[PDB]
Amino acid sequence: MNPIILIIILMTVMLGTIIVMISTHWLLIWIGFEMNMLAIIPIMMKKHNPRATEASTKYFLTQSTASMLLMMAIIINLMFSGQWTVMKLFNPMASMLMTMALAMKLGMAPFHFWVPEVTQGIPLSSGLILLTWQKLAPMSVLYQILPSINLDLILTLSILSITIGGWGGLNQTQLRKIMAYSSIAHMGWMTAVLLYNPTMTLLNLIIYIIMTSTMFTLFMANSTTTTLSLSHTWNKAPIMTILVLITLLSMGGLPPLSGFMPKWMIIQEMTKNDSIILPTLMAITALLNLYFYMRLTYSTALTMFPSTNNMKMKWQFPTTKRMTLLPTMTVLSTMLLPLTPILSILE
Amino acid sequence: VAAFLKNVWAKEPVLVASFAIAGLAVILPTLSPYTKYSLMINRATPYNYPVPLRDDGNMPDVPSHPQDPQGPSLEWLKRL
Amino acid sequence: MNLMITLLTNFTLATLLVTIAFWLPQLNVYLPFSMKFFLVAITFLLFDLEIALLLPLPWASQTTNLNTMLTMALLLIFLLAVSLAYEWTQKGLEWTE
Amino acid sequence: SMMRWNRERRRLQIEDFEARIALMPLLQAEKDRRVLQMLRENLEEEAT
Amino acid sequence: MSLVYMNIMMAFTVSLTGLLMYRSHLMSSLLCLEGMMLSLFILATLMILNSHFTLASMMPIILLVFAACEAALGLSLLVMVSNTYGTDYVQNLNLLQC
Amino acid sequence: PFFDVQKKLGVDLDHWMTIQSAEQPHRIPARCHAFEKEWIECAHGIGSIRAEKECKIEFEDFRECLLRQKTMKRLNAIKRQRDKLIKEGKYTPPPHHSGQEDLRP
Amino acid sequence: MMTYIVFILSIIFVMGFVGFSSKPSPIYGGLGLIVSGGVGCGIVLNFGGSFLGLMVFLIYLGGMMVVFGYTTAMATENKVVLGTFITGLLMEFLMVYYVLKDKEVEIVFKFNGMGDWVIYDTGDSGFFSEEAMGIAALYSYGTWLVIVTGWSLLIGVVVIMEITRGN
Amino acid sequence: PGIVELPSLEDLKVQEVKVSSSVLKAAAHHYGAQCDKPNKEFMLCRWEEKDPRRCLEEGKLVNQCALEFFRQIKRHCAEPFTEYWTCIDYSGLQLFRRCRKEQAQFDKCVLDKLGWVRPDLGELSKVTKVKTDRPLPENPYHSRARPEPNPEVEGDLKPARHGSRLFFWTM
Amino acid sequence: MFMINVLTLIIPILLAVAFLTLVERKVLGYMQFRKGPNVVGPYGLLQPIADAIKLFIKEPLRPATSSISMFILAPILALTLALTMWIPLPMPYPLINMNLGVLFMLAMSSLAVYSILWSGWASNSKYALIGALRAVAQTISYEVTLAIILLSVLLMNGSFTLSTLIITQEQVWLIFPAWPLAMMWFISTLAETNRAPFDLTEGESFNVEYAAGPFALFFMAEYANIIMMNIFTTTLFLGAFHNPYMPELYTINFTIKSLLLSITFLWIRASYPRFRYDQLMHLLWKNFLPLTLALCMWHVSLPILLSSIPPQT
Ligand SMILES: CCCCCCCCCCCCCCCCCC(=O)OC[C@H](COP(=O)([O-])OC[C@H](O)COP(=O)([O-])OC[C@H](COC(=O)CCCCCCCCCCCCCCCCC)OC(=O)CCCCCCCCCCCCCCCCC)OC(=O)CCCCCCCCCCCCCCCCC
Ligand SMILES: CCCCCCCCCCCCCCCCCC(=O)OC[C@H](COP(=O)([O-])OCC[N+](C)(C)C)OC(=O)CCCCCCCCCCCCCCCCC
Ligand SMILES: CCCCCCCCCCCCCCCCCC(=O)OC[C@H](COP(=O)(O)OCCN)OC(=O)CCCCCCCCCCCCCCCCC
Ligand SMILES: CCCCCCCCCCCCCCCCCC(=O)OC[C@H](COP(=O)(O)OCCN)OC(=O)CCCCCCCCCCCCCCCCC
Ligand SMILES: CCCCCCCCCCCCCCCCCC(=O)OC[C@H](COP(=O)(O)OCCN)OC(=O)CCCCCCCCCCCCCCCCC
Ligand SMILES: CCCCCCCCCCC1=C(C)C(=O)C(OC)=C(OC)C1=O
């Protein structure tokens, strides 16, 4: 791809999400989602192989279906309210359709079935964009419509995403599917706290984006898309194994790390609202996520897998890859828990 | 700036005419003295009913009848 | 109403003439895919959407916001021209130019 | 030629619109009595 | 509410269930998707014309334009799928199960 | 994250199409302009939670302007009782509801 | 019967959607969506939307479904379809029978069964079409809408040229 | 809710202006000149009251002042007016520009026998002022009392007592 | 009484299409240093009747068509759309006086490519489908400049009303302020009707499976389209004088101009070789479309800078 065309297309992805974040009219929300999907299709077809075309076709079909359901929810809102303000919806059917549409755009279970396929089909940088930047616009729409979101629907989606994303990553050896099921479980955690305190939704979103960007940046820096190619990293770059160790222990939510910060605050907001069974079962279900994170830490940092002879050639060459913000992201994804009360800046 | 223009006029006169007509479309309404009259004629066209005002007692510029002297006039449009 | 009658009359005359032409002589016994055509059809579709944006201009010239209207009209025709210029320079208009 | 004739057509349009404006109070009074007539007839038949 | 809205919503749900139950062709899925768009156009248009909501009269055009651009993108994806397998069958798009 | 860039910069990107009671071309009113103006001026500034309970009358009047469900239900009742009385023969329509009176103006 | 003309056109509209959504072949599906687009244009025309209905003909049918049938003719060259078609047809005519015998129905929303002429306005708009004026205001009031739509169409040109190249 | 209050069929009886629209369009400019005051009283009442039931009597004055307009044409200038509205009536769009000499004869006969001057281009579209004796409607939308607003923020902003109070943080 | 008006529109359409074939064969005769048909009728006037009777009793070609339904629908759609393009035409009064008649004609002419597409797919021949796809791509290409030229011209009209376009041209023909639009319009209508030098359905570098009857139906739809686009070009750029008390002056005047413009189509097919397919694609996308966009900008900005914005009504 032409680098100028790449810059214009990435600015258009950003512009679509920004239009979603700044607009007061529902048509401009829908336009921001259309602009974002249209611009992100070439980022997925960047390398021109049949797996990327299949991933882009599956992504197109799910996001287009969600976009039509979103427009039907907008149109039903216009029936029962005569207006277009991005605020609470004025019909429970429109609220259900918009919550379904946003759950499809997020890839929350049981609309999760595209996220491991599309994440596996595309390069690591475009899957980084898919799992971090593409969550931002539907979460902002969920933020603004929460006075009309049905509680049982959003909590069903939340627990179903956490359980399905926990069990889905246990069977995986591909790193992109591991990050995709990890994404599904973390979005379940974000929507579970949404009607109680959406500031903790924003906190979980930001910490998830930092940790996921860290893991994708490590995978890009080591050119690893499988568990077994990530297991060669100790014989090539031993600092990278320490970084994937601390970041995966943080994504499991183990204190004293920063990824313990969201779920703890989420439990802290769900028990104030007298929900005790639900954050309990959510936290116990997240042990599945920690189990396959620990599987990756065993294969990468805590043991030394056998290498190959040709690795000795790669000892003679330094990493020329721009590992953009990787030390900053690695520090923020691990050492941020003593600054947990900084979350009030999200209020 | 002069050999280039003659070169592109010899090779591609369709594109030279296209960019010339488009440039005259862009810059000439800012240079026309009659662009103001377009706005004046559009705002002088009465699509709606001129809903009258309650005479509170002190409105010297608002007429009491259409044939009164005060009020907006269209002599500029009859004359031009 | 007169329009529905006229459409029904034209459709009835056309169906009657087709029924004659398929059943009057019954009395006697007696590809590989081309990317280029798809690209010109999609270029038609995109410029046709741009035309759909341009179609309310004879009504849009009647506004009292003429500086804004003229700016946006010239900007839409300019973006249609930039679409054509990008289609030109990236060899999209080639072998069916 | 189109400049002169479109300016004349705009003046003719303003004359048509002011004929409309001068007729609108009579039409509005007739429309009001028309709709109140029809609502009163519907009200009496609803009562019976 | 008014009786035509029932049928336009039912048309949307019929094209929704057509788009949510594939048979074989990706083109038939794209046709059901654009049928969903057409019904959204008609429903938006009938609301906006009934309400005499003047500025929203430009809304369905925008809804048309974006979605037809979306449709163009879909056709291009189909063509690239059809440039891989010879058909646009959805059962050929299963490499990402593993 | 509704970053309110439009209020921050003072630009009107999309507030103009948002409601029917906004400024329209040629001052064309919506059919529910008065009801929407009443519901917006009621519910302004008091928050959505207080607006659900304190502006219910204006919002029900405005929803009934928008969809005319109570009006059509009443016309259903009148027309159905009229058809029943025509079938029973206990009513006859007047000449002005049959087309024999040569309307007003 | 003629007071129900928008309702009759909407019945034909749903019948056309059951036609193509049962998916016989994408060419017959294209034909069913064409007939549906024509009758939906007729519905829009009967609510007074002349320009929006002509946009359905010019842009949806004459622009987009032409490209659909074109791509289908370049790519292409039952019992489930017929059963699905009669299923949707019987569901639609049961809806018709219920809302005509009761003058009210409730599938998900409550629907009146009177002719949909009843909801209209009883005045005039003077010397303009209100729908034409609201579409004309895209250039005066819809500046940001023009910007985002034209930018999305330019990006759409660029995106189609990127993904169809294969390089 | 309440019973709607409609005026009776006797209160809606008035002597109608039973002339066609070409007659009205031919007489329109002199009608807007001569019958200005009750028309503008009615339209002021009609935009202020926002209710036709509150505007009936003024409307009758409109229907009283139009007829006196036409009788004064029928007494003096019936034949040039008839020749003018017939030529207006031929056209499908009812053009003024097709009928300028019949207009000139009608305006000549009206300016001579009645002294009426036809309004210039721009005059009948002016916003005029109307002196009325009816009171201004204090609540034309019939709105009830608005809900009381929430209390605003006031007072000096002091630091948070013992910090964030988040579980064990002292700041 | 309205049905009489519909019949006096559409049956003289069919008669004028029947005698356009005679006019074409005679004019292409006398421009090729020979005579046309002058044997069958007096001055050859019974040649279209004899040719119609010959085509109606010719043997059916019996295709093993892919779809029977679209094979029937393509002539029905072609003839129906060819007849409905005439109903808003002001000559001086239209059959259907509609406010958006220009846009109606643009939409109903954009629908006419489905007859080409359905006839090409309904044939078994892959090469008939390839020729149909080429013809559809040609037609949708020149529809772009049709739409934009027509929009640029109607910026001087004020509306989409076809009858207003007579009022627009009372002082001057509209070919005087818009002759570049007029000439690109005329060549674009030439390429719309698959007419020479744009007839690649007759060149060796789509409806061959139809019998003689349905081929005659496609042919008469095509000549109805030719006469109609010449009438529409006449109304659009060469608007005649209209006296409302003598409408036949307008009818005679527009009829003479439309006949001369149809004969100009006949002159053009007897004067030039064909384009190659990429060459008329080059003519559209690289020559007519940049000038058409430039002139569309110019005809947006010109009524604002001259204070010559036409009325809406
Ligand atoms: C006149 C103008 C000039 C005046 C100058 C005055 C100052 C002159 C001296 C200059 C230096 C002053 C330093 C700051 C004051 C002391 C802060 C302090 O100790 O807070 C006690 C803090 C609370 O104790 P306290 O008895 O209630 O308060 C005593 C004061 O009133 C504390 O005051 P406070 O009540 O205002 O404290 C506020 C609050 C008090 O704290 C709380 O409200 C409780 C929450 C604390 C956070 C708990 C996080 C738990 C989960 C994460 C566990 C981290 C893993 C452990 C570390 C791994 C190894 C790196 O602190 C925070 O919220 C900050 C978060 C903790 C950071 C403490 C400052 C560290 C600066 C240097 C960093 C170097 C690396 C340190 C290790 C990294 C982890 C911290 O102690 C702890 O929480 C235990 C951890 C100890 C903190 C670090 C000690 C600082 C000095 C380290 C030097 C050696 C570094 C060795 C190499 C690097 C490591 C390998
Ligand atoms: C409507 C009534 C009738 C109208 C006129 C029609 C009658 C005449 C018909 C003649 C026979 C045509 C048969 C078919 C021919 C098809 C080929 C053809 O014509 O190709 C077109 C040719 C194509 O060019 P070409 O292919 O021959 O040339 C080679 C082109 N390149 C360099 C790209 C390889 O020309 C055009 O496209 C021009 C279209 C009209 C342009 C009008 C410009 C007006 C003046 C603008 C200003 C110029 C001055 C500079 C700026 C000044 C600013 C103040
Ligand atoms: C309220 C919240 C509002 C919003 C707040 C902000 C949200 C930020 C969301 C972050 C999402 C970032 C997605 C990545 C950047 C987008 C463009 C991109 O992917 O560029 C990467 C680029 C591509 O390289 P390429 O050549 O394509 O690789 C193929 C192999 N040669 O180059 C590379 O691949 C180089 C490898 C390193 C790239 C690392 C990029 C890190 C960016 C994320 C930083 C962390 C998130 C920001 C901080 C927290 C914010 C919540
Ligand atoms: C394969 C199927 C068969 C194919 C062959 C036959 C069909 C193809 C050829 C016929 C195409 C039919 C097109 C019908 C609509 C055309 C648009 C239209 O009506 O525009 C004219 C006019 C708009 O102008 P305006 O002046 O504003 O309206 C009067 C207001 N004073 O609007 C009016 O005057 C409005 C008049 C009332 C509303 C008319 C509605 C007509 C019926 C609906 C469409 C019927 C056909 C549907 C399928 C067509 C094929 C897609
Ligand atoms: C600022 C005003 C508004 C501008 C935008 C609106 C334009 C309206 C017209 C629409 C044009 C859209 C398409 C433009 C495509 C341009 C790129 C191009 O054509 O490059 C290729 C061409 C060489 O042609 P080639 O590739 O060989 O094609 C086969 C034929 N030989 O390369 C060339 O022939 C070079 C073409 C560029 C130079 C032309 C210079 C004309 C100057 C006229 C006078 C100045 C006018 C004022 C504006 C400044 C223009 C630079
Ligand atoms: C019943 C009304 C007439 C039906 C159509 C038949 C007559 C018109 C087309 C016949 C025709 C003529 C005269 C003709 O001259 C000709 O050659 C150029 C044809 O073949 C291409 C024809 O098809």
UniProtKB/Swiss-Prot annotation, chain A:
Protein name: NADH-ubiquinone oxidoreductase chain 2
Subunit-structure text: Core subunit of respiratory chain NADH dehydrogenase (Complex I) which is composed of 45 different subunits. Interacts with TMEM242.
Gene Ontology molecular-function annotations: NADH dehydrogenase (ubiquinone) activity
Any single biological process term in GO: mitochondrial electron transport, NADH to ubiquinone
InterPro entries noted in UniProt: Complex_I_Subunit_2 (IPR050175), NADH_DH_su2_C (IPR010933), NADH_UbQ_OxRdtase_chain2 (IPR003917), ND/Mrp_TM (IPR001750)
Major location (coarse): mitochondrion
Keywords: Electron transport, Membrane, Mitochondrion, Mitochondrion inner membrane, NAD, Respiratory chain, Translocase, Transmembrane, Transmembrane helix, Transport, Ubiquinone
UniProt similarity note: Belongs to the complex I subunit 2 family.
Coiled coil: none
GO cellular component annotations of the record: mitochondrial inner membrane; respiratory chain complex I
EC number(s) recorded for this UniProt protein: 7.1.1.2
Principal EC category: translocase
Reaction catalysed by this enzyme: a ubiquinone + NADH + 5 H(+)(in) = a ubiquinol + NAD(+) + 4 H(+)(out)
Membrane topology: Multi-pass membrane protein
Main function: Core subunit of the mitochondrial membrane respiratory chain NADH dehydrogenase (Complex I) which catalyzes electron transfer from NADH through the respiratory chain, using ubiquinone as an electron acceptor. Essential for the catalytic activity and assembly of complex I.
Location(s), subcellular: Mitochondrion inner membrane
Domain of life: Eukaryota
TM region positions: 3-23, 25-45, 67-87, 96-116, 122-142, 145-165, 178-198, 200-220, 237-257, 274-294, 325-345
Origin species: Ovis aries (Sheep)
UniProtKB/Swiss-Prot annotation, chain C:
Entry GO MF terms: NADH dehydrogenase (ubiquinone) activity
Membrane topology: Multi-pass membrane protein
Keyword Nucleus: no
Coiled-coil annotated residue ranges, if any: none
Compartments where located: Mitochondrion inner membrane
KW Transmembrane helix (keyword) present: yes
Positions of transmembrane segments: 3-23, 37-57, 66-86
Main location: mitochondrion
GO biological process: mitochondrial electron transport, NADH to ubiquinone
Entry superkingdom: Eukaryota
A Pfam family that the UniProt record links to this protein: Oxidored_q4
Catalytic activity: a ubiquinone + NADH + 5 H(+)(in) = a ubiquinol + NAD(+) + 4 H(+)(out)
Keyword set, alphabetical order: Electron transport, Membrane, Mitochondrion, Mitochondrion inner membrane, NAD, Respiratory chain, Translocase, Transmembrane, Transmembrane helix, Transport, Ubiquinone
Documented EC number(s): 7.1.1.2
InterPro entries: NADH_UbQ/plastoQ_OxRdtase_su3, NDAH_ubi_oxred_su3_sf
One GO cellular component term: mitochondrial inner membrane
Family designation: Belongs to the complex I subunit 3 family.
Role this protein plays: Core subunit of the mitochondrial membrane respiratory chain NADH dehydrogenase (Complex I) which catalyzes electron transfer from NADH through the respiratory chain, using ubiquinone as an electron acceptor. Essential for the catalytic activity of complex I.
PANTHER family for the chain: NADH-UBIQUINONE OXIDOREDUCTASE CHAIN 3
Subunit structure: Core subunit of respiratory chain NADH dehydrogenase (Complex I) which is composed of 45 different subunits. Interacts with TMEM186. Interacts with TMEM242.
Record protein name field: NADH-ubiquinone oxidoreductase chain 3
Lineage start: Eukaryota, Metazoa, Chordata, Craniata, Vertebrata
From Swiss-Prot, chain E:
Entry keywords, A to Z: Electron transport, Membrane, Mitochondrion, Mitochondrion inner membrane, NAD, Respiratory chain, Translocase, Transmembrane, Transmembrane helix, Transport, Ubiquinone
GO molecular function, one term: NADH dehydrogenase (ubiquinone) activity
Membrane topology label: Multi-pass membrane protein
Pfam families, per the entry: Oxidored_q2
GO cellular component: mitochondrial inner membrane; respiratory chain complex I
Biological processes per GO annotation: ATP synthesis coupled electron transport
Annotated Gene3D superfamilies: 1.10.287.3510
Location of this chain's protein in the cell: Mitochondrion inner membrane
TM region positions: 1-21, 29-49, 61-81
Keyword Electron transport: yes
Enzyme class: translocase
Catalysis performed (reactions): a ubiquinone + NADH + 5 H(+)(in) = a ubiquinol + NAD(+) + 4 H(+)(out)
The organism's place on the tree of life at top rank: Eukaryota
EC number: 7.1.1.2
Family the entry assigns: Belongs to the complex I subunit 4L family.
Protein purpose: Core subunit of the mitochondrial membrane respiratory chain NADH dehydrogenase (Complex I) which catalyzes electron transfer from NADH through the respiratory chain, using ubiquinone as an electron acceptor. Part of the enzyme membrane arm which is embedded in the lipid bilayer and involved in proton translocation.
Subunit and interaction comment: Core subunit of respiratory chain NADH dehydrogenase (Complex I) which is composed of 45 different subunits.
Entries under PANTHER family matching the protein: NADH-UBIQUINONE OXIDOREDUCTASE CHAIN 4L, NADH-UBIQUINONE OXIDOREDUCTASE SUBUNIT ND4L
Protein name: NADH-ubiquinone oxidoreductase chain 4L
Natural source organism: Ovis aries
UniProtKB/Swiss-Prot annotation, chain G:
Known function: Core subunit of the mitochondrial membrane respiratory chain NADH dehydrogenase (Complex I) which catalyzes electron transfer from NADH through the respiratory chain, using ubiquinone as an electron acceptor. Essential for the catalytic activity and assembly of complex I.
Superkingdom per UniProt: Eukaryota
One example GO MF annotation: NADH dehydrogenase (ubiquinone) activity
Underlying gene: MT-ND6
InterPro entries: ComplexI_Subunit6, NADH_UbQ/plastoQ_OxRdtase_su6, Nuo/plastoQ_OxRdtase_6_NuoJ
Protein name as catalogued: NADH-ubiquinone oxidoreductase chain 6
Transmembrane segments: 1-21, 25-45, 47-67, 80-100, 141-161
Gene Ontology CC, one term: mitochondrial inner membrane
Keyword tags: Electron transport, Membrane, Mitochondrion, Mitochondrion inner membrane, NAD, Respiratory chain, Translocase, Transmembrane, Transmembrane helix, Transport, Ubiquinone
Signal sequence region: none
GO biological process terms, semicolon-separated: mitochondrial electron transport, NADH to ubiquinone; mitochondrial respiratory chain complex I assembly
Catalytic activity: a ubiquinone + NADH + 5 H(+)(in) = a ubiquinol + NAD(+) + 4 H(+)(out)
Locations listed in the record: Mitochondrion inner membrane
Assembly and oligomerization: Core subunit of respiratory chain NADH dehydrogenase (Complex I) which is composed of 45 different subunits.
Record's bilayer topology term: Multi-pass membrane protein
Record EC number: 7.1.1.2
Family: Belongs to the complex I subunit 6 family.
